[PDB]
Symmetry: C3
Subunit: 136 residues, 3 copies
């Protein structure tokens, strides 16, 4: 019921140097989860292996995942395969509109196995993902 | 003569949750190697860097490798380049038939430099790889 | 003014087993930097995450980077995105002529955001990169 895992991939630690930092993002997400009667567990890593371990744990616990894989979105089959194990919903979030930039950003290995996908609505995208999981 | 390195990539630790676990696989491989008069050293990691170090060691020791790179099979040039250094045979194994699934799984950076490749014969594929190395 | 970061990616630790080793390369680069009135800080890792941290530090310090990403050159969007943060020049170096080999080596995620690119001039490529940064 309560626990939602928010997982951020490579370079998302560099947020705010917008002016919103990753710590600020964690704080916004936590607050919104509280207002929605959820607990958000937010994690970020530049390491593919660390991201896979976190997905493994969400699979074993049957908890939902909101995932912004950063660059790995367009490149990693390993991450996609880890996510394919999830039984609870997977929501893909991108801060920027990945369809308005380079062609390589318009393909995601994650989109076809995600429940849904939100892009280009900024940091609010994460909050809106939270809200979707709350009404489901 | 005796030593064969079996290297498993990302997500192969999730075997059995088939019902064959990775530990079970290690056990099957070891037994078969013993019956063939070989020693199997089996290793698994979700970390590309760890996989590359293991390939580096096989190159320096001039020992054979049976490799199931998981997702990295379709994506990693770095791993392919590490494997290109091997002087002893490289056998590529996939549990599933990667040619019966998504198009992206039908390209391997490893196949063109491998001695040969076995797919879709399940866990027995590893054992059959062992047997090939024993008669060569 | 003085500091230039030279960053080597996966498999570059295997140099010399040419006969030039990575340690030898570090030594050549340092000497040339000294003769040019610079300091070269040379680093190598098989770990994408480690490479990204080093790029993050160059971005925060506003220092230049000479980067040979190895295999990650052709595959990593995450590394490209990290490098896009650099305000000082980025020079891409490849020891081999990547345009004379397999087709996959003829695409780089880094070239379009690099100041310039040197390939196929061997280890001297790094020294020539140093010299460019010295006259700019
Ligand atoms: O959510 C995304 O828009 C995306 O997933 C798009 C994806 O295609 C891309 O790989 C990505 O990482 C981009 C990125 C990551 C780090 C940096 S630092 C300066 C620019 C920059 C850009 C990201 C993550 C991202 C987005 C905006 C920002 S601003 C500082 C970092 C960062 C990361
Ligand atoms: O040997 C393969 O068939 C392959 O190399 C194919 C390759 O295209 C793929 O990246 C891969 O990793 C797939 C994978 C890895 C982990 C998991 S967990 C639930 C599904 C799943 C799937 C694998 C490894 C693989 C195969 C079957 C199974 S079952 C649980 C994990 C796993 C991993
Ligand atoms: O600078 C390059 O030419 C390149 O960036 C080209 C790039 O397309 C490739 O991924 C790469 O890594 C290649 C590589 C890396 C390690 C090894 S060990 C035996 C062969 C080999 C080849 C490299 C790095 C490279 C180049 C030459 C040598 S010789 C031993 C390692 C190595 C690495």
């Amino acid at each position: 019921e309560l626990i939602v895992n928010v997982i951020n991939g490579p370079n998302l630690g560099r947020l705010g140097r917008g002016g919103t930092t990753h710590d600020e993002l964690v704080a916004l997400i936590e607050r919104e989860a509280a207002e929605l009667g959820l607990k958000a567990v937010v994690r970020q890593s530049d390491s593919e292996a660390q991201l896979l371990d976190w997905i493994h744990q969400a699979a074993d616990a049957a908890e939902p995942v909101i995932l912004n894989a950063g660059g790995l979105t367009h490149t990693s089959v390993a991450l996609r395969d880890a996510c394919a194990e999830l039984s609870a919903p997977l929501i893909e979030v991108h801060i920027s509109n990945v369809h308005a930039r380079e062609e390589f950003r318009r393909h995601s290995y994650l989109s076809p196995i995600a429940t849904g996908v939100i892009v280009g609505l900024g940091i609010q995208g994460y909050l809106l993902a939270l809200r979707y999981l709350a009404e489901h």
